[PDB]
Amino acid sequence: SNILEMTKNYYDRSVSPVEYAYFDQSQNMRAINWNKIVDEKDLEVWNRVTQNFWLPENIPVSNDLPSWNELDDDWQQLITRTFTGLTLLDTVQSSIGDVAQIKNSLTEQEQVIYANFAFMVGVHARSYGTIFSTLCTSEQIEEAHEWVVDNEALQARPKALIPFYTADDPLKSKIAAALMPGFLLYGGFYLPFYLSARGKLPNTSDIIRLILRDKVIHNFYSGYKYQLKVAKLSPEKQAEMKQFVFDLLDKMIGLEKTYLHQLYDGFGLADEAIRFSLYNAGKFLQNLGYESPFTKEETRIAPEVFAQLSARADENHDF
Amino acid sequence: SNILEMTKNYYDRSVSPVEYAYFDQSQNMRAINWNKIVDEKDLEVWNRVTQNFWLPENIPVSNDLPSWNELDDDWQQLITRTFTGLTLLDTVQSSIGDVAQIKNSLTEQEQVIYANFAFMVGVHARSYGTIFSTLCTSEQIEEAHEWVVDNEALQARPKALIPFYTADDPLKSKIAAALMPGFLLYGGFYLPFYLSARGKLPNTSDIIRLILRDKVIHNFYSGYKYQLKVAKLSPEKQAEMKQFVFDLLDKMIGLEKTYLHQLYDGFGLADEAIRFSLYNAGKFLQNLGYESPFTKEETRIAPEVFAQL
Numbered sequence: 001s002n003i004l005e006m007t008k009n010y011y012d013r014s015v016s017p018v019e020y021a022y023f024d025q026s027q028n029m030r031a032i033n034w035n036k037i038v039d040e041k042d043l044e045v046w047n048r049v050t051q052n053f054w055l056p057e058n059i060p061v062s063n064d065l066p067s068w069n070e071l072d073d074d075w076q077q078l079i080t081r082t083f084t085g086l087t088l089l090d091t092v093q094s095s096i097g098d099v100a101q102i103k104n105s106l107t108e109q110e111q112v113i114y115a116n117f118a119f120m121v122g123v124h125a126r127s128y129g130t131i132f133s134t135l136c137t138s139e140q141i142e143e144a145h146e147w148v149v150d151n152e153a154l155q156a157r158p159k160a161l162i163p164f165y166t167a168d169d170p171l172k173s174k175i176a177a178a179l180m181p182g183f184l185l186y187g188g189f190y191l192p193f194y195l196s197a198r199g200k201l202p203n204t205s206d207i208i209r210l211i212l213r214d215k216v217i218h219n220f221y222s223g224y225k226y227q228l229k230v231a232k233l234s235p236e237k238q239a240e241m242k243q244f245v246f247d248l249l250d251k252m253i254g255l256e257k258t259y260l261h262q263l264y265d266g267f268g269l270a271d272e273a274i275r276f277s278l279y280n281a282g283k284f285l286q287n288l289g290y291e292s293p294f295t296k297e298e299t300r301i302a303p304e305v306f307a308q309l310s311a312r313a314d315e316n317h318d319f
Numbered sequence: 320s321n322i323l324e325m326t327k328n329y330y331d332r333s334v335s336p337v338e339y340a341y342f343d344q345s346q347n348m349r350a351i352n353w354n355k356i357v358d359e360k361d362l363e364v365w366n367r368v369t370q371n372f373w374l375p376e377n378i379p380v381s382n383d384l385p386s387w388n389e390l391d392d393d394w395q396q397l398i399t400r401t402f403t404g405l406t407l408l409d410t411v412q413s414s415i416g417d418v419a420q421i422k423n424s425l426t427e428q429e430q431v432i433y434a435n436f437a438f439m440v441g442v443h444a445r446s447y448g449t450i451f452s453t454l455c456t457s458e459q460i461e462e463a464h465e466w467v468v469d470n471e472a473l474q475a476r477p478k479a480l481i482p483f484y485t486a487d488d489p490l491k492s493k494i495a496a497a498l499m500p501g502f503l504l505y506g507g508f509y510l511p512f513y514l515s516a517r518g519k520l521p522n523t524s525d526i527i528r529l530i531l532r533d534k535v536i537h538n539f540y541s542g543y544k545y546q547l548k549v550a551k552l553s554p555e556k557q558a559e560m561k562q563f564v565f566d567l568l569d570k571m572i573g574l575e576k577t578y579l580h581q582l583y584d585g586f587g588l589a590d591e592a593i594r595f596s597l598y599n600a601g602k603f604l605q606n607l608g609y610e611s612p613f614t615k616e617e618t619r620i621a622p623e624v625f626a627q628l
């Protein structure tokens with residue numbers, strides 16, 4: 001009789017609206033409570049991603065015109081194709097992937113953070129448009145859209161992830177949501193960093209660094225939430241989900257290698273791009289609480305390219 | 320023989336990812352094209368809502384403490400309850416309502432704009448948290464959350480709209496989405512408008528005005544897209560959809576009147592709040608391309624409150 005409550009906590013006898021909408025219409029709904037935070041990590045991530053708000057209009061991409069004009073039509077086509085491919089992946093994640101995470105949230109604040117992620121990946125997709133508007137002809141832009149629609153190897157990658165977003169397994173959906181910012185775009189990000197290391201398109205690489213400042217947090221956060229949810233499963237179910245993660249990454253690496261060999265055909269950059277990709281595949285696995293199986297030889301990045309990748313985003317570009 | 324295409328444009332033989340994901344897996348996916356924009360209104364709305372980015376940290380709510388301390392416990396409770404009620408609506412809009420619109424978009428840019436809306440109405444909900452952190456006791460905050468969960472009249476309003484978001488009729492979902500910032504907002508916003516006019520809580524009022532600046536664009540945009548899409552129905556199905564809008568608004572006015580009576584009756588503000596609500600219900604219908612059926616008498620607003628619209 002010593003521990004009887006005079007009133008029962010509202011939180012434990014109500015559900016978030018998204019729970020009510022998709023899972024259980026038997027309880028009443030609670031408003032989000034930002035005054036009593038369940039997980040302090042949510043507040044840290046919310047504060048970082050909102051403080052990091054930026055728009056591509058902030059970057060003087062016009063200052064890349066001299067170095068753009070030092071690249072032949074084949075290079076300009078490769079860049080337009082690569083970036084239109086990255087635009088497709090960001091369109092997938094903004095319109096499907098990140099918003100699909102909201103209903104599977106462990107906390108109230110996580111629901112709002114994934115809304116931020118979906119919006120900011122939309123800004124990432126929009127930023128390629130800003131670059132194209134400054135550097136590319138109408139013909140180059142149209143050709144790259146045609147090439148992306150008609151590239152089966154390119155299309156195979158988002159087609160492999162989308163079913164996990166639309167299905168009812170929240171852990172498989174979460175793994176897909178981590179794999180996109182954690183892995184799938186790095187083969188393309190290699191190209192601007194390779195070029196900027198050789199003195200070309202420095203302002204473009206500034207936009208890539210603003211995109212990556214967001215992507216690394218998206219990857220970290222989805223991996224963090226995956227680890228909390230998978231830890232509640234039986235040992236057998238945890239082993240099954242680990243096998244699924246490695247099986248899906250295995251498939252996605254195969255599809256990425258096939259695509260990058262086609263994309264970089266005639267440039268000989270596929271092997272360098274793939275090593276850069278696998279370095280990031282290792283960090284993706286580490287963010288899900290697993291060990292990287294990749295050899296030093298397989299993940300070797302030129303220091304000049306690593307310097308572009310690791311350079312901190314220019315705060316002058318912050319909103 | 321004169322009109323054959325040598326190659327069909329990529330746009331008309333591909334689909335956006337969200338179309339591929341939910342509706343048709345038979346075509347390949349196109350990347351969003353921000354260089355060739357189908358509707359210039361999308362670019363205008365995108366530029367306005369992104370340029371209007373704000374966070375509640377950048378308002379000095381602490382400067383309201385003297386004004387807040389001029390309000391008795393009953394007034395402080397009413398404000399905390401009203402704002403926690405608006406927090407619930409914003410939580411519904413952020414987590415379900417706005418994101419449900421993405422897959423039903425007419426244009427590529429509309430998909431990204433509704434992602435912005437979902438995020439920014441999340442910022443609206445967060446901004447009430449900022450106000451409470453500065454002004455309210457932990458007891459006042461917890462009481463208001465308890466009140467929201469146990470208020471059946473309050474709960475009835477989002478419970479009536481959520482089924483449209485999760486169902487497969489995109490125009491009914493669009494209407495249910497617009498009713499949140501376009502109608503249910505105003506019963507609650509009456510209170511800060513009333514208090515501001517009497518000289519209370521000027522810094523809190525700055526947050527309310529930043530929220531309003533976003534919500535008026537949200538309502539315009541959903542209304543704009545509704546009118547474009549309902550224009551592509553048969554005359555018979557256009558008539559059916561008009562009847563649906565009036566039927567659902569009639570239901571939502573019934574639920575709102577019951578809630579505002581329970582929220583305000585002890586303060587004698589319910590009749591003023593309901594007239595304010597009905598005025599904005601008239602504007603909601605005009606925003607969908609319909610006529611207001613409401614009388615001058617039942618939509619009467621005090622000039623100093625009317626001025627803040």
Ligand SMILES: [Ca+2]
Binds near residue numbers: 268269270271272
């Ligand atoms: Ca090579």
Ligand SMILES: [Ca+2]
Binds near residue numbers: 588589591
């Ligand atoms: Ca009265």
